[PDB]
């Protein structure tokens, strides 16, 4: 086992939430690794649409807007292309997913349209990507408009792979809590009371899992920050044990390429 | 009374303002397309030609850019329609209306505009968005808020008139203000709380932070201050770290109620060449008082020292009170 | 009646540009009247 | 709203009842169209881009669709009946026989002169083509031709209004003339210079806008919605908006409506009570760490939820510059309007 | 106006269980307080996105976009 | 194309008909979206 | 005559290069200068064309080939040069050139810009030559936009007699250090003409092809 | 509307290097290098992994507005070393560091799946 | 262009040590496959 | 791409040779024969080019040049291998016909180049206009020809013409040409300038920022045309004659 190298302890997992310990790690690369995880995966999603027929009591934009937050299968990333970088005109084959839409509201009773009748039509290639994301019990999913007697939507849209960075609607991370020190043994925040500090504060789960400091004991004043608690829930569309590896593979691909940069001058220096 | 006292006026525009804390105190944010409607004649020389004719190329659709060639004998080309953004050949003494670019001099001010400094000069820098930036210490003279005051700026259109609101209008100018012979800006607001929270006797700083602040500083020397506890563990005082803002030179005695050479209640201040000896420094030192910090510092070296000094405090504390913390509650009203 | 001193074209093709208070000739780009 | 043609119309995405509510509101039926959205603030001082009534806000939070408005708009016309002979027709115009004609396209028009729903009109285009006949004894001081036989009296949009035709109205007026009437739809969504307000006589601006990582959060993972100064708080003694937060906090927390009405036995040691059954610091301070760095925070910050409404200046509709442009006929000075882009 | 369907604050999805959330109201008969954290709401956000939600979407529905009086 | 304002009933009308609806007669007529859905860039 | 050949690897790394280098230093003899080249792809912009009609035109910019530029489309080549000192003496003398040239670049990107668009443009920079034992290897990393693409080998040689032995060599090569997918192309433009730069434009082509 | 695009924060424009070295002038041997795009997340990282090193003596960086995506790093070390390589080795340790947490958190969550 | 006498010295130095160097590549390679690329960190002890 | 400032005239036959002589008495450098053969090529009428700006007129068509030396074995025909190749030969070149037909020319299908109508204002002593340039070297492919690849980029052949004439070198770079155009067409061949040599001088300028450069330029033009005064009047042509837009048609010849 590399004995050398950050340590981990997983307590906590399921198909949404992972619960764990980091040890032995400085509090800048904890700090990097959930901002990394938070911001800077991609993921696939609805990125355009067009519409033929609309005879709802809702706006275009407004749906527009709701289409382009529902969360989509995205496992196999790894294999399409940004759409700024593939040769087709618009959206390719390769660079690109499209989807339909089509409801009518037929019955007197008004009629729910759900997220379940997002359509392919495109070629995926042996591809896992672009199925929804069901999690209710249902399995209705998102729903998405409302229709009466005699309405119709009908639309196709075109969903492309990004990140976080540039929307919200990218992200596959809901919440990641971050804790750390439970007892204050370093000194590191400052307590507001009116009678006894002691009591007013409550405490946290984690002080289970060291020690109560001892009254007799004078302040360490050489500790450091080492043991950090962390838990991870993803919006569903990615495995969360996968967010945290592809956290981790996206920030040693960023310091590759600061490595990459650096040799390529000190190349060109050599010049 | 209202066509021959005042009238409406041409190469002007009006927005809102907001705060932006990074800017430097004579230095105003205008926006984008604000920057792309407004002109200024430039006359083309030897020293330019490179540069306007490149602009004249880039045309009128981007920043930065041309709109307008005047040439010597009145007539004048609209760059959109004349194909010749990448035609025209510019000679000595043609003009090119260019877009306003960083460090163009503007007159800015607020209605109404009941005394003399509430209409000063700023240097521009380009930004996104729609609202002007304004340094946090000059909305004193101007009595503005940002709950939705929109103000006035004016663009010269010479040399002669660029001189004048850069040698008299100018921000660093107005200091020291003639109606009452005191300061008219100071630090307020959340600087001023924290510049307080700072220089306690009780706050000691650690290696790492006191590196960043002093990168922070732009003036600095890449000289690290020796702490004042090298063992059992190196920390610096807060009154260290701010010491570095201060220019050398500057010394100051204030004597408060009760406060003796050796002072057990902090108060007072005393400051030898720069260095903080002992006091908390609060608002009857770097506010807009007579006798403070600010009056003696533009007192003895100069208008733009102290204009480097705004800039230099607010950033250090700036940074320090990003990572203290501050706020207020319903708490704090029990007895 | 409004020409270009330059391109002597007729019928002349002029474009008013109302939101600067000028006469644009659509070929060379001059200025005709102003204001 | 959705048949209404209102010169002017603003409608809220989301709109959410408060969770603090007086019990005369279910008289004024506050609780049926609310006019805001309960927003997490936390009072403190980050980064320094809050001071003198400006605030900061998430960016995420805006890009999943808080405080999102649409925009409608409308238009009218109709032929007039000069004499006894039409002097003006619904047509699409040619430039054959038309002169004055406006540097808008007028390509989007149908066949009837009149735009169809659907189409994203923009800067100075028209929507409307009406033409005037014009006697033939009445000449424009040489400037009409031979062929020209009749002038524009096209509309176009406001030199900044952007968006898509939303509905188009033919009908006739009580004297029998054409009459045709044109809404506009748009979206409008928050930015830097905006305009928000608490109940409790508390309005800003948006000064700067921050992403769901440079925004401080607690142990639990949660992020403030926006974030104002503390400075705000003594000379206003506001401590109704404190309360606000305190109770609306407790009400979230346990899930039914708080009363919040006027000369009653609420009390703020009470609600405090309720406040620490579920687990938090009873003064409603939380810890909450560094986004950039991920360090502790060495005071704690007053953090809660409250109710906010937009205002109904933009900073969009109040931004104006001019080099040149129009003059006037008598004083031949820049002309007044910020729409008719005036010194 | 038909329910938002994430969360401004956490990102999380509320969309779909509103119409659960509904069911438990009357035919459980339960409070709201038990039925909010019966969907694994638990932050008090996704609290505040469900439980304050005003259902514009049943008032226009009936109604047409052609002819409202004043 | 037009469509009437109380039944919604598919009229077409020439550039010198009255502005009527043929079943129900009232003197209110709308419009009908562009059949052929067009693609825009906003700019 | 001289022969060449081209292979991309598209799932390489940032370190690929340097292993590929080192698995080869036994046989390295010697190393030269630094090389250059660009890739752009221009589309046309109008829409009244046939079926049978491309649409697209790639060009190839190659730095040590003496700033030459390489426009291909459906297998026609075209080479222009730029620079003063490629220009045959017959041209200066009797008038149909000024004598200072510009790269086809800005006249497709300055004045046909109404009938030819750029779309794409990948760039390669600070690449290393390695002189073998009757062989010249070059290597570099590919930059698009968005950043790393990948590995690109581009081998020449004067004898042509085992020129398919060495190329099965560096397939080797590349197979102990785990680089399994790539694409490597050897073909000619033209079997009757032979242009040597050409040839090498058209197997780039249809090296970086997607 | 004056808001720029977000693909800004990610892409480089055409001409831009992804790295700029300039000489300090001040203190022997310290160098201030420009990273384009990027925000904290690396640059609290390199600086953090940069004390580290005996050999350097100052290493601290800034984020001059928070409109640009871009940071500057300023390093300075002992006499006989240079700046680059202390860089470059504070690239690496990161990288191994990174790899052995990866393997670390693979055994575990196998490991958690086997008594899944 | 040499500035110093001590760099002169050197200069010289480095003359005769090349020198020798040059005439025994000759030698070698007239008869051997020397490397022109191999640069070790630490000189070989004596 | 270089700014080239010209000036332009012509001459009747009868004075030819005496004109030569003078020039030689001058430059101190005798005269060298040339020949040229250029083509244009217009933008295909077929293909709508809707990407022109109409509402800001951005770019407007115009039309490329290609140029090419073709070797004197066509030029002179069963007659004339008696005389050695010389200035003289231009003595005999006053008919319509010429050995080289369309046929040659046909079977023959380089410097491409484009150009812009003058700068305009009426403070300009010499006709400037801006040229750009590019050489095409060899090609290859399954149909590598000059026609091929014009029409691959979209252009088509609209007419050609051959130009004989002689060259003058002077200092500074002054070039001065006496020329001869010969419009060929399946029809026949045509001499435009009948009965007369059309009288080029011109220099050409790298860069047109710098501007002591273009004012020393202009210097010597000037000059040179004031030492001419008396014999042949040099003159700026109309700025509307050197315009090679498509959408207006003219050709100055």
């Known amino acids: 086992m590399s004995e050398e190298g950050p340590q981990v302890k997983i307590r906590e997992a399921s198909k949404d939430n992972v619960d764990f310990i980091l040890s032995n790690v400085d509090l800048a690369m904890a700090n990097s690794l959930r901002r990394v995880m938070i911001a800077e995966i991609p993921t696939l999603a609805i990125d355009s649409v067009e519409v033929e027929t609309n005879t709802t009591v809702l706006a275009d934009e407004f749906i527009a807007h709701r289409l382009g937050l529902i969360p989509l299968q995205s496992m196999d990333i790894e294999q399409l292309e940004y759409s700024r970088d593939c040769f087709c005109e618009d959206h390719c084959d390769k660079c690109s997913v499209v989807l339909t839409l089509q409801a009518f509201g037929e019955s007197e009773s008004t009629t729910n349209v759900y997220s379940k009748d997002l359509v392919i039509v495109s070629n995926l290639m042996g591809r896992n990507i672009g199925h929804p994301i069901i999690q209710d019990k249902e399995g209705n999913g998102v729903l998405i408009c409302k229709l009466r007697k005699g309405q119709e939507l009908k639309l196709t849209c075109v969903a492309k792979k990004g990140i976080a960075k540039e929307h919200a609607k990218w992200g596959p991370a809901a919440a990641i809590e971050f804790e750390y020190d439970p007892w204050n043994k370093l000194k590191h925040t400052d307590y507001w009371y009116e009678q006894d500090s002691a009591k007013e504060w409550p405490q946290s789960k984690n002080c289970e899992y060291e020690d109560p400091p001892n009254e007799g004991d004078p302040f360490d004043y050489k500790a450091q920050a080492d043991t950090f608690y962390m838990n991870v829930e993803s919006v569903g569309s990615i495995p969360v044990d996968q967010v945290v590896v592809r956290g981790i593979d996206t920030l040693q691909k960023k310091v590759a390429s600061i490595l990459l940069a650096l040799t390529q001058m000190d190349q060109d220096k050599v010049n | 009374r209202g066509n021959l006292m005042g009238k409406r006026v041409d190469f002007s525009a009006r927005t809102v303002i907001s705060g932006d804390p990074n800017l430097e105190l004579d230095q105003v944010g205008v926006p984008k397309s604000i920057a792309k409607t407004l002109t200024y004649p430039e006359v083309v020389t030897p020293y330019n030609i490179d540069r306007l004719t490149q602009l004249v190329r880039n045309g009128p659709n981007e920043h930065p850019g041309a709109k307008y060639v005047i040439r010597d004998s009145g007539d004048r080309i609209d760059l959109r329609y004349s194909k010749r953004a990448g035609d025209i050949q510019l000679q000595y003494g043609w003009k090119v209306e260019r877009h306003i670019m960083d460090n163009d001099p503007v007159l800015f001010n607020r209605q109404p505009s009941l005394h003399k400094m509430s209409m000063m000069a700023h240097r521009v820098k380009v930004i996104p968005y729609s609202t002007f930036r304004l340094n946090l210490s000059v909305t004193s003279p101007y009595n503005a808020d940002f709950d939705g005051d929109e103000m006035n700026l004016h663009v010269p259109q010479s040399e002669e008139t660029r001189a004048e609101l850069s040698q008299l209008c100018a921000v660093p100018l107005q200091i020291v203000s003639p109606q009452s012979n005191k300061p008219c800006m100071g630090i307020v607001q959340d600087t001023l709380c924290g510049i307080r929270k700072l220089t306690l006797r009780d706050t000691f700083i650690e290696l790492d932070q006191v590196l960043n602040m002093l990168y922070w500083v732009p003036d600095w020397d890449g000289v690290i201050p020796t702490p004042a506890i090298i063992k059992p563990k190196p920390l610096w005082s807060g009154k260290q770290i701010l010491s570095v803002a201060i220019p050398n030179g500057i010394h100051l005695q204030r004597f408060d109620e009760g406060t003796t050479l050796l002072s057990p209640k902090d108060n007072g201040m005393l400051i030898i060449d720069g260095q903080i000896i002992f006091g908390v420094v609060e608002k009857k030192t770097v506010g807009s008082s007579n006798g403070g910090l600010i009056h003696v510092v533009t007192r003895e070296k100069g208008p733009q020292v102290c204009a480097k000094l705004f800039g230099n405090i607010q950033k250090v504390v700036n940074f320090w009170l990003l990572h203290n913390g501050f706020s207020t509650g319903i708490g704090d009203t029990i007895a | ?35 | 709203y959705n048949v209404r043609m209102d010169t002017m119309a603003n409608i809220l995405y989301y709109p959410q009842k408060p969770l603090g509510t007086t019990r005369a509101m279910e008289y004024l039926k506050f609780r049926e169209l609310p006019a805001g959205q309960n927003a997490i603030v936390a009072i403190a001082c980050y980064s320094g881009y809050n001071q003198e009534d400006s605030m900061i806000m998430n960016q995420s939070s805006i890009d999943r669709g808080l405080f999102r408005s649409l925009f409608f708009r409308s238009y009218m016309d109709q032929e007039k009946k000069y004499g006894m002979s039409i002097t003006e027709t619904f047509e699409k115009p040619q430039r054959t026989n038309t002169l004055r004609m406006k540097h808008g396209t007028y390509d989007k028009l149908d066949d009837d002169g009149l735009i169809a729903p659907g189409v994203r009109v923009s800067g100075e285009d028209v929507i409307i083509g009406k033409t005037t006949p014009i006697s033939p004894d009445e000449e424009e001081l040489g400037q009409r031709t031979a062929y020209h036989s009749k002038r524009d009296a096209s509309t176009p949009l406001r030199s900044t209004e952007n968006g898509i035709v939303d509905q188009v109205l033919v009908t006739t007026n009580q004297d029998g003339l054409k009459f045709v009437k044109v809404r506009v739809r748009t979206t409008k969504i928050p930015q830097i210079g905006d305009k928000f307000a608490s109940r409790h006589g508390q309005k800003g601006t948006i000064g700067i806008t921050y992403r769901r990582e440079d925004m401080p959060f607690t142990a639990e993972g949660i992020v403030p919605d926006l974030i104002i100064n503390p400075h705000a708080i003594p000379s206003r003694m506001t401590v109704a908006h404190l309360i606000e937060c305190l109770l609306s906090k407790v009400a979230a927390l346990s899930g039914n409506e708080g009363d919040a009405s006027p000369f009653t036995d609420i009390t703020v040691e009470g609600i405090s009570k309720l406040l620490r059954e579920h687990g938090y610091q009873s003064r409603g301070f939380e810890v909450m760490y560094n986004g950039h760095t991920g360090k502790k925070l060495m005071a704690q910050i007053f953090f809660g939820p409250t109710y906010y409404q937009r205002l109904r200046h933009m900073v969009d509709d109040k931004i104006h510059a001019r080099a040149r442009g129009p003059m006037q006929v008598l004083t031949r000075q820049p002309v007044e309007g910020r729409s008719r882009d005036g010194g | 106006m038909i329910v938002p369907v994430r969360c401004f604050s956490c990102g999380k999805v509320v969309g779909d269980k509103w119409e659960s959330y509904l069911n438990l109201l009357q035919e459980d008969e339960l409070d709201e307080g038990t039925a909010l954290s019966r969907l694994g709401l638990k932050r008090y956000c996704c609290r505040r996105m469900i439980l304050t939600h005003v259902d514009l979407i049943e008032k226009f529905l009936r109604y047409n976009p052609l002819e409202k009086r004043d | 194309k037009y469509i009437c304002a109380e039944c919604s009933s598919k009229l077409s009308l020439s550039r010198t008909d009255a502005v009527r609806c043929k079943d129900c007669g009232h003197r209110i007529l709308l419009k009908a979206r562009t059949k052929r859905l067009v693609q825009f860039e906003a700019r | 005559m001289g022969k060449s050949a081209v292979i991309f690897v598209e799932r390489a790394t940032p370190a690929t290069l340097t292993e590929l280098k080192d698995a080869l230093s036994n046989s390295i003899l010697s190393v030269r200068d630094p090389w250059s080249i660009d890739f752009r792809t221009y589309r046309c912009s109008i829409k009244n064309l046939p079926a049978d009609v491309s649409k697209l035109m790639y060009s190839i910019t190659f730095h040590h080939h003496g700033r030459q530029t390489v426009l291909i489309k459906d297998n026609s080549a075209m080479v222009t040069t730029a620079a003063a000192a490629d220009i045959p003496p017959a041209l200066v003398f009797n008038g149909s050139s000024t004598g200072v040239p510009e790269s086809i670049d800005t006249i497709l990107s300055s004045k046909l810009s109404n009938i030819w668009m750029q779309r794409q443009l990948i760039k390669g920079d600070a690449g290393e030559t390695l002189i073998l034992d009757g062989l010249t290897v070059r290597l570099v990393n590919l930059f698009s936009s968005t950043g790393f693409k990948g590995l690109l080998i581009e081998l020449q040689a004067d004898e042509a007699g085992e020129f398919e032995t060495k190329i099965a060599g560096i397939e080797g090569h590349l197979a102990e250090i785990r680089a399994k997918e790539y694409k490597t192309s050897s073909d000619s433009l033209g079997p009757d003409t032979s242009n040597e730069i050409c040839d090498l434009a058209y197997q780039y082509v249809r090296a970086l092809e997607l | 509307m004056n808001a720029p695009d977000r693909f800004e924060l990610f892409l480089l424009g055409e001409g831009e290097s992804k790295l700029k070295i300039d000489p300090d002038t001040k203190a022997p041997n310290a160098v201030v290098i420009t990273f384009e795009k990027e925000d904290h997340t690396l640059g609290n990282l390199i600086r953090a992994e940069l004390l580290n090193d005996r050999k350097v003596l100052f290493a601290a960086y800034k984020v001059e507005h928070p409109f640009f995506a871009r940071f500057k790093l300023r390093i300075q070390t002992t006499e006989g070393y240079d700046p680059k390589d202390a860089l470059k080795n504070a690239c690496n340790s990161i990288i191994n560091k990174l790899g052995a947490l990866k393997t670390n958190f693979e055994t575990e969550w196998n490991l958690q799946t086997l008594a899944a | 262009r040499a500035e110093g006498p001590e760099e002169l010295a050197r200069i010289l130095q480095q003359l005769k040590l090349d020198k020798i160097i040059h005439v025994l590549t000759t030698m070698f390679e007239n008869t051997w496959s020397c490397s022109r690329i191999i640069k070790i960190d630490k000189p070989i002890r004596t | 791409m270089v700014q080239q400032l010209s000036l332009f005239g012509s001459i009747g036959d009868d004075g030819y040779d005496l004109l030569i002589s003078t020039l030689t008495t001058i430059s101190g450098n005798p005269p060298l024969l040339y020949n040229s053969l250029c083509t244009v090529w217009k933008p295909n009428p077929s293909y709508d080019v809707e990407n022109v700006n109409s509402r800001n007129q951005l770019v407007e068509p115009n039309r490329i040049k290609l140029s090419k030396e073709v070797p004197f074995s066509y030029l002179i025909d069963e007659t004339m291998m008696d005389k050695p190749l010389n200035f003289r030969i231009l003595k005999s070149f006053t008919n319509d016909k010429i050995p080289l037909n369309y046929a040659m020319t046909r079977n023959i299908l380089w410097s491409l180049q484009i150009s812009d109508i003058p700068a305009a204002g009426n403070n300009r002593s010499v006709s400037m206009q801006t040229i750009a340039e590019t050489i095409i070297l060899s090609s290859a492919g399954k149909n590598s020809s000059v026609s091929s690849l014009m029409n691959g980029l979209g252009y088509v052949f609209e007419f050609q013409y051959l130009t004989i004439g002689v060259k003058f070198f002077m200092k500074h770079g002054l070039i001065l040409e006496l020329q001869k155009i010969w419009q060929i067409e399946e029809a026949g061949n045509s001499q435009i300038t009948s009965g007369g040599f059309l009288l080029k001088a011109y220099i050409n300028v790298s860069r047109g920022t710098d501007i002591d450069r273009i004012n020393y330029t202009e210097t010597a033009l000037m000059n040179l045309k004031k030492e001419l005064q008396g014999y042949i009047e040099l003159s700026v042509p109309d700025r509307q004659s050197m315009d090679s837009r498509v959408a207006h048609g003219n050709i100055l010849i």
């Open chain 3, 1 to 35: 009646v409004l020409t270009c001193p330059e391109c002597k074209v007729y019928p002349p093709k002029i474009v008013e540009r109302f939101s600067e208070g000028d006469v644009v000739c659509a070929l060379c780009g001059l200025v005709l009247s102003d204001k």
